[PDB]
Amino acid sequence: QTIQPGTGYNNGYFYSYWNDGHGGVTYTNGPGGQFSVNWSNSGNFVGGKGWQPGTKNKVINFSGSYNPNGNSYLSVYGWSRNPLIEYYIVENFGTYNPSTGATKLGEVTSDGSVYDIYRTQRVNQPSIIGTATFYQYWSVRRNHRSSGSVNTANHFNAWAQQGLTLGTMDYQIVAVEGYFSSGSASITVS
Numbered sequence: 001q002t003i004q005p006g007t008g009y010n011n012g013y014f015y016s017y018w019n020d021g022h023g024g025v026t027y028t029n030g031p032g033g034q035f036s037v038n039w040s041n042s043g044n045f046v047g048g049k050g051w052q053p054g055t056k057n058k059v060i061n062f063s064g065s066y067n068p069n070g071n072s073y074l075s076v077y078g079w080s081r082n083p084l085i086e087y088y089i090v091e092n093f094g095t096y097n098p099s100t101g102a103t104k105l106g107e108v109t110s111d112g113s114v115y116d117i118y119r120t121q122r123v124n125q126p127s128i129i130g131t132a133t134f135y136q137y138w139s140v141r142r143n144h145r146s147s148g149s150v151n152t153a154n155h156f157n158a159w160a161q162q163g164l165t166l167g168t169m170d171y172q173i174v175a176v177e178g179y180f181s182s183g184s185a186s187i188t189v190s
């Protein structure tokens with residue numbers, strides 16, 4: 001159903017839905033691993049389904065409709081603790097590449113595309129443990145897509161090689177993120 005920001009479990013999948021309070025976002029849980037987000041003139045939000053906690057060898061499948069209009073990402077998305085890390089395996093984005101301004105650290109080939117690897121830092125921002133400073137890890141797919149399979153081990157292993165180490169996993173979902181934009185998406189995870 002349509003729900004307010006929060007986390008929990010639906011139809012055997014963890015979900016997380018977060019927004020910055022701006023308005024203009026509608027998050028809905030569907031049957032099985034499905035969720036939908038429709039947004040119009042939003043702020044920043046992140047929502048999706050998967051697992052709590054994630055693992056470092058999960059093979060994650062996603063399929064659906066992803067129709068951003070503006071700044072938005074479609075990613076395997078999750079956190080670790082000790083160290084506190086927000087990570088992204090970006091499968092699609094709209095008008096803005098999240099690595100713009102970031103230093104490239106390497107590459108990994110996985111699931112039919114090369115990905116570029118970057119580290120960034122968030123300073124005094126919201127997080128799974130409240131206001132914090134923390135690194136983010138990125139794999140950015142060169143050839144976008146809105147359905148597919150992601151072997152997360154390929155990414156985590158490549159990151160690790162580059163000195164990008166993950167701590168104990170927290171949640172791990174397929175998430176739609178928007179950043180002051182509009183769009184519609186409906187994704188089924190497995």
Ligand SMILES: O[C@@H]1[C@@H](O)[C@H](O[C@@H]2CO[C@@H](O[C@@H]3CO[C@H](O)[C@H](O)[C@H]3O)[C@H](O)[C@H]2O)OC[C@H]1O
Pocket residue numbers: 044071096098136179180
């Ligand atoms: O991890 C997420 C970050 O990627 C996100 O950073 C914002 C991404 O959008 C940038 O704005 C773009 C600048 O370029 C053009 O002008 C675009 O139209 C803008 O959208 C912001 O500058 C970054 O802060 O922050 C949220 C975090 O979850």
Ligand SMILES: *[C@@H]1OC[C@@H](O[C@@H]2OC[C@@H](O)[C@H](O)[C@H]2O)[C@H](O)[C@H]1O
Pocket residue numbers: 016018046126127128129130
């Ligand atoms: C964005 O950062 C905030 C994360 O959600 C918070 O998690 C910690 C809870 O105490 C807080 O109430 C939540 O808002 C969200 O998972 C990330 O996507």
Ligand SMILES: [Ca+2]
Pocket residue numbers: 092093094144
């Ligand atoms: Ca795209």
